Amino acid sequence: HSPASGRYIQQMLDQRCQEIAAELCQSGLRKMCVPSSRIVARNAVGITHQNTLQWRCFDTASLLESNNGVNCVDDCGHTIPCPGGVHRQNSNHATRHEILSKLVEEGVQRFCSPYQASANKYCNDKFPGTIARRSKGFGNNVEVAWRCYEKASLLYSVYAECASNCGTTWYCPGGRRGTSTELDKRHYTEEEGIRQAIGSVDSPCSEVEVCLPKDENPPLCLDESGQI
Numbered sequence: 001h002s003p004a005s006g007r008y009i010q011q012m013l014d015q016r017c018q019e020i021a022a023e024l025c026q027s028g029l030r031k032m033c034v035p036s037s038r039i040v041a042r043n044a045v046g047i048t049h050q051n052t053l054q055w056r057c058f059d060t061a062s063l064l065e066s067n068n069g070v071n072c073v074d075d076c077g078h079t080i081p082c083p084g085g086v087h088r089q090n091s092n093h094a095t096r097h098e099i100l101s102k103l104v105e106e107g108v109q110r111f112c113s114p115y116q117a118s119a120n121k122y123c124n125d126k127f128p129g130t131i132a133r134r135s136k137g138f139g140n141n142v143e144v145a146w147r148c149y150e151k152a153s154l155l156y157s158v159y160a161e162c163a164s165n166c167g168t169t170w171y172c173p174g175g176r177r178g179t180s181t182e183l184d185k186r187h188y189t190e191e192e193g194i195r196q197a198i199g200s201v202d203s204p205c206s207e208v209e210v211c212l213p214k215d216e217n218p219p220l221c222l223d224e225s226g227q228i
């Protein structure tokens with residue numbers, strides 16, 4: 001078991017989209033009659049005129065290899081660029097923004113570390129749209145620091161440090177490579193503010209318990225060992 005996000009919200013959205021595609025197939029929508037491996041949930045634009053980011057059930061065979069990028073979701077419910085792009089003319093998808101958004105809201109309660117939630121809130125309050133990671137900055141692929149990152153600048157396939165539900169080291173999808181692209185500039189380093197945000201969270205365990213973090217809330221609170 002790795003100290004890493006299970007990406008449980010994204011897993012649930014993909015499974016719900018697989019059911020929805022199957023239902024649409026049964027209603028006669030031929031292009032949706034596919035194996036489950038062909039269907040994922042992504043947050044993205046759609047075809048021409050569908051210009052807002054919405055949750056949609058995509059046929060992967062209709063996605064482009066690049067980036068109209070598509071976004072996946074972390075276990076605190078933030079949308080982050082994933083591999084691929086929407087074909088604005090040829091996309092095969094079903095927009096299902098309400099059911100999928102509701103599943104994200106439910107998942108956040110289950111899976112989002114209150115320590116990470118506090119860090120994210122700090123960042124969004126100060127720089128709207130940003131989330132917290134301890135990751136790379138511009139043109140340096142070694143140094144990490146707590147920063148508020150514009151979500152568009154993160155890569156879902158790259159794991160970066162985040163706060164566990166014990167306020168300890170964890171890793172989450174949505175990270176930086178430390179490359180030198182314009183996107184690599186889109187962050188605000190906030191070591192003191194983010195650390196204070198994380199430190200301000202009340203423990204789920206008592207002062208007489210040891211917090212062992214888990215990929216779902218609550219963490220394990222084990223009775224502290226005695227002076228045996």
Ligand SMILES: CC(=O)N[C@@H]1[C@@H](O[C@@H]2O[C@H](CO)[C@H](O)[C@H](O[C@]3(C(=O)O)C[C@H](O)[C@@H](NC(C)=O)[C@H]([C@H](O)[C@H](O)CO)O3)[C@H]2F)[C@H](O)[C@@H](CO)O[C@H]1O
Pocket residue numbers: 137138184185186187188189190
């Ligand atoms: C704002 C500024 O110029 N402050 C001077 C200090 O420079 C800042 O030092 C921090 C170190 O914590 C960063 O190196 C920093 O760079 C970044 C960042 O936060 O990582 C680089 C980002 O690309 C940029 N974001 C953009 C362009 O979208 C941010 C952003 O400009 C900034 O966070 C806004 O507050 O900055 C860097 F700017 C400097 O170290 C001290 C003393 O020398 O003086 C400050 O005034």
Ligand SMILES: [Cl-]
Pocket residue numbers: 005007074075076172173
């Ligand atoms: Cl996560």
